[PDB]
C-alpha cells in the first residue's frame, strides 16, 4: 500500500534524501554553466 | 693442546682442595649436632 511512507518517513533516510537532492541541485548548475565568473 | 678451552688448566684445585674442605667441615659440624634436629 501507500503505508510505506508512514514507515519510510524516519528523518535519517529523509536527511540523506534531502541532502542528495540539494547536492545534485548544486551539481546541475555547476554542470550546465560552470563558466560564469 | 687441542680444540677445548683452558678448563683442564684450572678446574682441579677446587675439586681437589676446597670441595673436600667444605665437605669435611660440614661433616664435622654435623657429627656434633644438638637434639632432635639436624642438617
Amino acid at each position: 500500500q501507500n503505508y510505506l511512507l508512514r514507515y519510510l518517513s524516519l528523518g535519517p533516510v529523509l536527511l540523506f534524501a534531502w541532502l542528495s537532492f540539494t547536492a545534485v541541485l548544486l551539481i546541475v548548475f555547476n554542470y550546465l554553466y560552470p563558466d560564469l565568473l | 693442546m687441542f680444540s677445548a678451552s683452558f678448563l683442564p688448566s684450572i678446574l682441579v684445585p677446587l675439586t681437589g682442595l676446597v670441595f673436600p674442605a667444605i665437605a669435611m667441615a660440614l661433616l664435622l659440624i654435623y657429627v656434633e649436632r644438638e637434639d632432635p634436629s639436624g642438617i
Binding site: - | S3, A4, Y30, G38
Partner: protein, 31 residues
C-alpha cells in the same frame, strides 16, 4: 673431528637432570 663449545653444551646437560635428580635420590633417606 674434535669438538668446540659443544663440550660446554654437554656439560650444560648435566647439573639439572642428573645433578639434582641424584641429589633427591640421595636426600630421600633422611640424613
Amino acid at each position: 673431528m674434535s669438538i668446540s663449545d659443544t663440550q660446554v653444551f654437554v656439560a650444560l646437560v648435566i647439573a639439572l637432570i642428573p645433578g639434582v635428580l641424584a641429589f633427591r635420590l640421595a636426600t630421600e633417606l633422611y640424613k
